[PDB]
């Protein structure tokens, strides 16, 4: 009736963001492994009309989208992480910071993750939703 070492939403969110962005810096071709099927992903971008890019869905599309984004030596400065329990044992995480790709200039971003348990493996969360937007494509 109590799990005395169950990680709090705060610890889940903090460790997740740490793992996500440290992996992005060194092995972005593995980033897709954080995502489940029917996960949603958008990472800024602008379409041919100059409107913000649409999300893709599923680990297959996500792997393809990440690899099209050409992350190379991606440096991040995380400024705020806020993580709280959602329903159904999920965790919602709000992230603000700056991200630099290919040693280009840092770009501010605003991001939301929804993490959800795999189903049953103990203390295992996948990314169900990843909403990321660069401020310079919105503001």
């Amino acid at each position: 009736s109590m799990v005395m070492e169950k990680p709090s939403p705060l610890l889940v969110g903090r460790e997740f963001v740490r793992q996500y962005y440290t992996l992005l810096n060194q092995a972005p071709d593995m980033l897709h492994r954080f995502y489940g099927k029917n996960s949603s992903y958008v990472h800024g971008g602008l379409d041919s009309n100059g409107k913000p890019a649409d999300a893709v869905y599923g680990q297959k599309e996500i792997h393809r989208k990440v690899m099209s984004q050409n992350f190379t030596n991606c440096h991040t400065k995380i400024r705020h992480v806020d993580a709280h329990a959602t329903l159904n044992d999920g965790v919602v995480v709000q992230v603000m910071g700056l991200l630099s790709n290919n040693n280009q200039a840092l770009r501010r971003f605003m991001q939301t993750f929804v993490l959800a348990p795999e189903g049953s493996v103990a203390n295992k969360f996948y990314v169900h939703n990843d909403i990321f937007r660069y401020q310079d494509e919105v503001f």
Partner: peptide
């Protein structure tokens, strides 16, 4: 505590830049 289909310690190893051989 792990995420996605990563094994315990796997992200930390890969995020440290560890690689092996010439692949």
């Amino acid at each position: 505590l792990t995420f996605g289909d990563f094994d315990e310690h796997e992200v930390d190893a890969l995020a440290s830049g560890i690689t092996f051989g010439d692949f």
